[PDB]
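Example 435, ligand dotinurad.
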Amino acid sequence: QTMALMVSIMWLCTQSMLENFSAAVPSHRCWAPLLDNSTAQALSPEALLAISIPPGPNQRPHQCRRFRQPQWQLLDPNATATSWSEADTEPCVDGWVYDRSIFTSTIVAKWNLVCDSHALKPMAQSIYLAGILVGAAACGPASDRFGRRLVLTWSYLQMAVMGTAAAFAPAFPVYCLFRFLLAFAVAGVMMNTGTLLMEWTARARPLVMTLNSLGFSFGHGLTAAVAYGVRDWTLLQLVVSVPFFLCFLYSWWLAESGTLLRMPGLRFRTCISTLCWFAFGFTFFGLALDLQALGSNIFLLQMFIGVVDIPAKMGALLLLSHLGRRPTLAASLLLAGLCILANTLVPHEMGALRSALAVLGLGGVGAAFTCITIYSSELFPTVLRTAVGLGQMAARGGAILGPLVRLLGVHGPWLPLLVYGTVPVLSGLAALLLP
Ligand SMILES: O=C(c1cc(Cl)c(O)c(Cl)c1)N1CS(=O)(=O)c2ccccc21
């Protein structure tokens, strides 16, 4: 049934977007004696925070440095500001405390993802996407040998097990391994769902496709409410993985009640298709995992993303039927690129406009994915149609490289978004030359 696959892809969407909320970084500072000790520390907590922690980014108290001694010189206005020396600070060693207003417990606040380990969250996303790649590369022969239903049930069981395991992970490497196995099973489910929806009915192939995307969509759209309802990441992952335990009931139908010629042949079409897939995967998995910086409210941002991505990718099929395949694809790619570029061009004070631009860019990359996945079925004849698998592998590689460019935020907060806006523009300019 199509409804079962839609529910499955919606829950896989919740599992995928779980990383955007469980790895959210709140405003943090490390333990200070004049702010977290007993009453003897004294009134005016802002003055205590100012004299105990030097200023930092965005004219805020430094989230990564603490004063070893209380600097009373900055509190009295008669003295010159920024008079403290660098030697008076200590490397924020006494452990970090986090704001429990928005999120009560996250993977950043649990394992102390701080300056020295700030690359762990993008490294965790990269490990997840590498697990996705390994699963997509491995479950192929497994599905061809052991059957699609058996590997589907095994992947569902693995998703459930790894979800319940990562919900209670005591260490960071163990959590990374759990996420790697969960991503392996996610990729297995993805491959099986794609292989089944490609040939269950198909003329109706574009309709079925539009459909699994209206899918991941209703998804991010429902995962925002789930993240808003459950403030603890452990119980959040638990209640996200329980639906997979429920879907495991359909195992065994209720108990019975090669192709390397894609590179030399059509090399131009092959490289262009792989470039578009790489660009889409890169942009999507680089933007959909850092929504905290793209908007002011992550939940409202995701809800707006979904409610605007529904009609865009709905009319994407009308555009494909009326205007063609290449023109609408190039137009959507250029629109997404221009939106992500204007997201950096606009100042950060226009939060609503930044959120709107991010939503428009995500809708554009979704429409571009729809266009390219409809066009890949006609770029190559039946003899060459594993070009689709090669494009999928290229998109997975782009997804993997996605979080790796986010490390450039030290050189500037706009560089990752600058790349996320520049890559789709070049992708559309290259796809414009398609026949
Ligand atoms: O990862 C993939 C993916 C990769 C390949 Cl190679 C595929 O063939 C397919 Cl169908 C999906 N995503 C991530 S997503 O947000 O679910 C999402 C939403 C909409 C379209 C694709 C897609």
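Summary: Residues 28-98 form one domain.
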